[PDB]
């Protein structure tokens, strides 16, 4: 975690580390805390949030995403018989 | 060439819009078909998610519903085709 | 709606208020790759929320909790002492 | 300062932790007696709940599980103190 002040001085080098490694950097100040971190990575966490953040809808992705982790409930489907039936 | 595989969630969302809205079937038809080609790159907005949700990958059917899914070199599958309340 | 680098390392003090005010990230360019801006309370406050819902059993049990609390028929009522008590104090 | 209240599934909870851990009961214990006199302030990192679940705190018990709470002028409710798998 940085100071507002050193942020601002380093404001340039810390946009091409988040850039980088994709870790979020915080920043302390009086008028609050702020977070930087990447466009790619904030548009990637706001979809994530997205995602998880209606009751119902995170817990049926999670189901999917556990019942996927143990890999076999799955089955196959052509993308041609998908186009037949959307026709 | 790389093959799909659904969730049987996935499928019953996919069922849904065939009846609801079969525009939003074709779009989630055209989605899957573009996924298969190259499944990281391209239309709708292809977003790695993060945290428990890390390894997989969402595409914007609407600017509501999400298709979210999981690529190997062999095979994609999807997890969810509908955003629920 | 985006800002430069430039004007952003500028206006740093008065935007760290800005996005912790009107809670609305901003979006930054750059040379080296864009960059958001956001209020780290709102950031975090978001993170545990989604913390909570994403155990599915957990999500559910949660709101099971909250649609009583909204009806209000089930809740009951405790001191801390009977609490003290049974828990052998508190620490 | 403020009356607490529960809903069933926190005082069970609370039961469960009497039985399994006391130590963690005692922290939880501790968290009700912090919140009734300054909801929102304290140890336990306490946060805003968002969205769906906005209007509702969260502090921690431990690294995993939540104290989750509403709080008035007059009385504070918990409805969680277990997180779930």
Do not use: C
Request: hydrophobic share 35%.
């Amino acid at each position: 975690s940085i100071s507002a002040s050193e942020a601002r001085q380093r404001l340039f080098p810390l946009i091409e580390q988040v850039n980088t490694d994709h870790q979020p950097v915080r920043i302390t100040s009086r008028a609050g805390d702020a977070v930087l971190m990447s466009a790619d990575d904030y548009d990637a966490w706001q979809e994530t949030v997205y995602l998880l953040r209606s009751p119902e809808n995170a817990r049926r992705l999670m189901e999917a995403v556990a019942r996927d982790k143990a890999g076999h409930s799955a089955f196959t489907k052509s993308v041609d018989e998908l186009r037949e039936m959307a026709g | 060439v790389r093959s799909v595989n659904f969730d049987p969630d996935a499928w019953e969302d996919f069922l849904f819009w065939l009846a609801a809205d079969r525009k939003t079937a074709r779009r989630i038809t055209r989605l899957i078909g573009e996924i298969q080609r190259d499944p990281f790159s391209g239309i709708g907005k292809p977003e790695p998610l993060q945290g428990e949700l890390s390894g997989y990958w969402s595409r914007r059917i609407d600017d509501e519903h999400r298709l979210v899914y999981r690529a190997g070199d062999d095979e994609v599958t999807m997890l969810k085709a509908r955003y629920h309340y």
